Design a protein around this ligand. Structure first.
Ligand SMILES: *[C@@H]1O[C@H](CO)[C@@H](O[C@@H]2O[C@H](CO)[C@@H](O[C@H]3O[C@H](CO)[C@@H](O)[C@H](O)[C@@H]3O)[C@H](O)[C@H]2NC(C)=O)[C@H](O)[C@H]1NC(C)=O
Lengths: 102, 221, 235, 296, 51, 52, 51, 40
């Protein structure tokens, strides 16, 4: 008979005989998982002493009460600051001692 | 014929040998080119780049291999889509099952390569092709990390009962310690907190066995 | 064209075609689409002789060009029913149509599924002139002559005698199919991977094979292989 | 505010829509000096009538060096998969001379034409096994058809832009006289014109400039971290660059289905055998191929 | 739009149903969210709503 | 293994297909240091439940 | 370059021979019109003189 | 509006985005671009 021949499907380290090999359209479904989450939380910020001016170093005692792995930015003080440590890990009770010229 | 398969990488980057252990118990081998951020696909996981802690340079060379496997050979090994003048590879042909004869179209000739010359009666044969050997030959051979896909993760009383200790501190392998346990279930163990050197990852059968692991310390705790 | 012969044309419609023990006699009968009419008398309850002068030379399938259609030697699932390999079954209400083809003048179409093979029928005189499930009365189909007009088959399927695989080998394929499609969770209501809530309207088209077990298998990284060997059945 | 400049109210056109409180509509141009960082600058409004007037406060916050996204492109994580359907001759009946034309999207050989999970993978015949070993008893050889997929199971996507420049810019908050507060980032080193409401701010003094090599930014959609590289980019993927697949829809950046994104000729590693073809690749990951820094 | 394609458009009792019902089929952007329950209407299909 | 890094199991989605033994499906990314040649490196998996 | 039938057929253009063009295409749920393939955008430029 | 006056190829600064295009320019005012005197 005018046939191509027998079929064998080899699929990722296997050798399998098909009773019926074919393609067809099927009725299916799809799912979705909502994106986004949000966080906020009180932090203790205190100032032991200050030596701001032109000199880069200052003594600032701020803390965090949070658990998030990824830490966001931080900000500056008056008279044009940009703290060398804006992002610093926020998982555990790790205080942050910044530097300024205020 | 004696057939050679060739590839012009024209580069050299460190790579290693990796064997893998699926949590189910599968063991599949492969060779990751972990100096390049290549992504080898298998099962669910994929491993990728590491640290190129040393690199070196080398000229335009690439590999020559024989199908009967006489030996392995190296050459300048020029290669492109076409056969340039004076190169190692003139006939470049793309089917091993059709590499005995010359019948597949994929492989590509050279203009006026074959030496036909005439006479007063009939023409005679000559050639100007060059063998791979002794034409241009310059030698003769004598942070690993992975990305996770959609895994197929699966899911009581137990005693430790150590037996002995070996000797290594500050040797690159560490000392090997043996522990004789038994557990009613098939399970896996975890870290000793005070060992203070490394974590643990043992796996046991439901009998009394021993599985030995490597560690180093100044004094045993 | 014909495996063996061109199917007979007999004017007197009221005739029930009987059984035959012969192997090389039923194939040209299968060429005549004799078996599909028997399904109607069994489930649809109509003595409609199907496809006069048609054979396998004019039957058309939804995909525009079918290479498997050119090859009459291969075997299609509805023709795996006469020979006892597989059996097509009725349709339940929870089973839904596929909006692909133009359902004009039909009575019997196939749809391979995850579980089995499904056939749908209408009444005699109930011409099918729309994709809907509703069948419509009309006298324009009183004559039984139709070149596969009522016989339109979905999919491009090849079938053959097979030798099974152990149960564990089946389990390997089922798990591996789950990993390759991380997004797919629910199919035809049958669980593929349990997930959270899911939408509904989405037609879906991947290749598949059957190895003698309940759960169908799908693939995207497969390599086929064509061998033909002298088998007494294949004559 | 310490530095303050009043408007030029000589443009006078006010309609007396209400008698108790007046109304007026005006425009013009102004030249106010740059204030020190961390302070706000003012702008005084005057009317010919005495009692009423308003103000506008322009607050600066930061000074830094960013560059503008001249383009934008996405990069998925390519993987190379390849199939092989192996007919043999007189059984696939495929032409003695392989058809030099190849239909790269349909592939009627295996289920007509449908959506292809590859982005324009190629086609071809091959050399032919024929005889008792391959078993279909014909002497003449057999063509084999092959696919290549560029695929992405669980991608990690990067959006990139080749500014290839660095000019000073700042942070500005604005105070409409009504009481609105709208933020934006003006590239005030370049005479850019940002549009909002009624007003537009523009250039400042480049009191210091610096030079830097051909580098530009790499960012991740899950936001692993932020990365820097030589970061070559153009309309096409040049040899040896960071970005090969350059694809222009985030919602279509998970799979490879939009036409906008553009492949590389013979990038995927298809190689043949006596039975069927196997997959390899020569693509390079973004990391550790050409990386000259890593952001703290 | 909803139309019975026989005796013209759907009824008000029909179109009001076909934002709550589960038998009148339709095209996409109407089944993902509005829920075409796709009643397998072999004969006498209910009225289809498209864009 | 001497160098060992545990997973980040914060991605939690486990379906209780069976009560005696649980099931779960997860993914992610990991960064383990390169081990010396001739030795194997590990990767620990954790679940909110204790025993397994 | 003078009519722009896309936005109100062809009229007086307050630009002096400004150009025309398509662009790259946003497509998907983010831009919201649910088609996969990208979208062309048409743009004008005016050379103008208020006062 | 008169045809007699003549433009410059690609003089006006059109640039695109993911949604819509924004305006810029590269033209120069007559003053302080190339000025070598000012009449008393
Ligand atoms: C529709 O129903 C028909 C009767 O219910 C049925 O006819 C029956 O067909 C079977 C086929 O297996 C015959 O079974 C015997 O004959 C076959 C070979 O023909 C043998 O291999 C079997 O072992 C068995 O001995 C029945 O004899 C036959 N019925 C009668 C009364 O003879 C049709 O096949 C049914 N058609 C469909 C599509 O379901």
């Amino acid at each position: 008979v005018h046939k191509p021949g027998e079929v064998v499907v080899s699929y990722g380290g296997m050798r399998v005989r098909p009773k019926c090999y074919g393609f067809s359209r099927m009725m299916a479904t799809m799912e979705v998982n909502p994106p986004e989450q949000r966080i906020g939380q009180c932090t203790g910020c205190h100032l032991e002493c200050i030596n701001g001016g032109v000199r880069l170093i200052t003594l600032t005692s701020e803390l965090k009460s949070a658990t998030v792995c990824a830490s966001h930015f931080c900000s500056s003080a008056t008279s044009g600051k940009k703290s060398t440590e804006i992002h610093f890990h926020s998982g555990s009770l790790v205080g942050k001692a910044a530097i300024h010229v205020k | 014929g004696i057939i050679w398969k060739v590839s012009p990488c024209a580069a050299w980057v460190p790579s290693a040998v990796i064997e893998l252990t699926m949590p189910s118990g599968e063991v599949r081998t492969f060779h990751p080119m972990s100096g390049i951020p290549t992504q080898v696909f298998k099962g669910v996981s994929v491993t990728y780049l590491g640290s190129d802690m040393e690199v070196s340079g080398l000229t335009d060379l690439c590999e020559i291999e024989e199908l009967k496997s006489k030996k392995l050979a190296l050459a300048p090994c020029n290669q492109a889509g076409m056969g340039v003048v004076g190169k190692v590879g003139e006939i470049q042909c793309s089917s091993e099952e059709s590499a005995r004869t010359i019948k597949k179209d994929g492989c590509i000739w050279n203009a006026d390569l074959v030496g036909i010359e005439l006479r007063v009666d009939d023409a005679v044969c000559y050639s100007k092709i060059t063998s791979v050997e002794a034409v241009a030959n310059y030698s003769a051979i004598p942070d690993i990390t992975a990305i996770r896909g959609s895994f197929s993760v699966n899911y009581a009383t137990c005693t430790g009962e150590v037996t002995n200790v070996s000797g290594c501190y500050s040797c690159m392998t560490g000392a090997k310690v043996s522990i004789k346990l038994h557990s009613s279930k098939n399970s896996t163990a975890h870290v000793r907190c005070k060992g203070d050197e490394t974590a643990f990852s043992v796996l046991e059968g439901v009998h009394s066995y021993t599985v030995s692991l490597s560690f180093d310390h100044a004094v045993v705790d | 064209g014909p495996i063996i012969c061109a199917g007979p044309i007999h004017s007197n419609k009221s005739a029930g075609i009987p059984h035959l023990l012969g192997y090389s006699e039923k194939i040209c009968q299968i060429d005549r689409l004799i078996h599909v009419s028997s399904w109607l008398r069994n489930h649809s309850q109509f003595q409609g002789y199907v496809g006069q002068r048609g054979g396998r030379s004019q039957v058309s399938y939804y995909p525009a060009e079918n290479s498997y259609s050119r090859w009459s030697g291969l075997l299609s699932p509805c023709d795996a029913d006469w020979l006892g390999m597989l059996v097509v079954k009725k349709a339940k209400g929870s089973d839904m149509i596929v909006p692909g083809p133009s359902y004009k003048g039909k009575v019997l179409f196939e749809r391979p599924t995850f579980d089995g093979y499904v056939g749908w029928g209408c009444g005699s005189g109930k011409s099918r002139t729309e994709s809907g499930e509703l069948c419509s009365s009309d006298s324009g189909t009183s004559s039984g002559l139709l070149p596969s007009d009522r016989v339109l088959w979905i999919g491009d399927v090849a079938c053959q005698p097979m030798t099974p695989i152990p149960e564990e080998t089946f389990l390997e394929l089922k798990s591996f199919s789950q990993s390759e499609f991380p997004d797919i969770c629910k199919i035809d209501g049958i669980v593929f991977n349990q997930c959270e809530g899911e939408s509904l309207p989405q037609p879906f088209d991947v290749a598949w094979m059957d190895v003698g077990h309940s759960h169908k298998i799908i693939m995207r990284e497969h390599k086929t292989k064509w061998v033909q060997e002298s088998s007494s059945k294949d004559f | 505010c310490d530095e303050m400049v009043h408007a030029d109210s000589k443009l006078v056109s006010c309609r007396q829509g209400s008698g108790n409180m007046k109304e007026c509509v005006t425009t013009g141009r102004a030249l106010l000096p740059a204030v020190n960082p961390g302070q706000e600058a003012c702008l005084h409004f005057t009317a010919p009538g005495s009692p009423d007037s308003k103000c506008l406060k322009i607050k600066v916050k930061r000074i830094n060096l960013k560059c503008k996204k001249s383009s934008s492109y996405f990069v998925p994580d390519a993987r190379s998969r390849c199939t092989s359907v192996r007919r043999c001759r007189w059984a696939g009946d495929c032409q003695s001379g392989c058809p030099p034309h190849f239909t790269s999207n349909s592939f009627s050989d295996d289920w007509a034409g449908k959506m292809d999970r590859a982005g324009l993978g190629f086609s071809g015949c091959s050399d032919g096994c024929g005889g008792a070993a391959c078993g279909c008893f014909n002497a003449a050889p057999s063509c084999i058809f092959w696919r290549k997929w560029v695929e992405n199971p669980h991608g990690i996507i990067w959006k990139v832009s080749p500014c290839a420049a660095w000019v000073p810019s700042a942070v500005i908050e604005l105070t409409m006289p009504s009481g609105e507060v709208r933020t934006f980032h003006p590239m005030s080193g370049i005479p850019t014109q940002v549009f909002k409401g009624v007003s537009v701010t523009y250039l400042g003094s480049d009191m210091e400039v610096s030079g830097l090599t051909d580098l530009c930014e790499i960012e991740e959609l899950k936001s692993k971290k932020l990365a820097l590289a030589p970061c070559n980019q153009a309309g096409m993927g040049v040899v040896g660059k960071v970005g090969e697949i350059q694809c222009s829809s985030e919602e279509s950046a998970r799979t490879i289905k939009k036409d906008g994104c553009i492949w590389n000729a013979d990038l995927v590693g298809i190689e043949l055998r006596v039975d069927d073809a196997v997959c390899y690749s020569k693509i390079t990951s973004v990391e550790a191929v050409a990386n000259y820094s890593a952001i703290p | 739009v909803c139309y019975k394609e026989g005796t013209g458009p759907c009824s008000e009792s029909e179109e009001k149903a076909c934002k709550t019902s589960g038998s009148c089929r339709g095209d996409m952007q109407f089944c993902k969210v509005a829920g075409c329950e796709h009643g397998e209407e072999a004969s006498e299909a209910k009225c289809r709503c498209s864009l």
